[PDB]
Amino acid sequence: PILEFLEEWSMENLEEISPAAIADATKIFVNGCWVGIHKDPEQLMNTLRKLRRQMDIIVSEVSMIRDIREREIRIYTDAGRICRPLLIVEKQKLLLKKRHIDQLKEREYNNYSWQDLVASGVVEYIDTLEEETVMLAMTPDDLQEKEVAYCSTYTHCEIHPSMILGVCASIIPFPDHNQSPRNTYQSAMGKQAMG
């Protein structure tokens, strides 16, 4: 489906293109194979994301990496990419609003679930190759406010930083006040406890 949509949005198949026009230079790839070129990268990556935030290309891990200086777009649809859920920040303002939190709070009575949050386009799955193209904030309470401007163009925002810790390392309380080797030793011993 992504191949079809790319064909339908002016991506010129590699066999048709005049071979010297490759200085148009947005070398679109799919799963790691040439599929053509494109002259407008910025209005193409704003359309693949606009699609992945509702439904045409599976809202799950179909990454879109536009490497600007290198002039490539890399779309991966394959198994083995560790993705991560991250919020969206449009114009220094979260897409999550109180309406979403209120709908999710009344979860058992509604039929509103995480999937309705992802269909609403406020949380998307960023894999790692797409992570090197996004500017994150750890907490919205800060890093989205005004001061001497560190970054004025954020693109996403962590749900909560404590989600970088795994299962056996989420048991340890105040794991930021301890030394890191001790935290690993706890991740070890916590698998040898009785219960």
């Binding site: 489906p1 079809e4 949509f5 339908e8 949005w9 002016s10 699609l51 509702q54 439904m55 045409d56």
Partner: peptide, 18 residues
Amino acid sequence: AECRPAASENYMRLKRLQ
């Protein structure tokens, strides 16, 4: 000459039609 669809999200319904 290209084959771009005439309008907005209609293309999404066109893919559902495919």
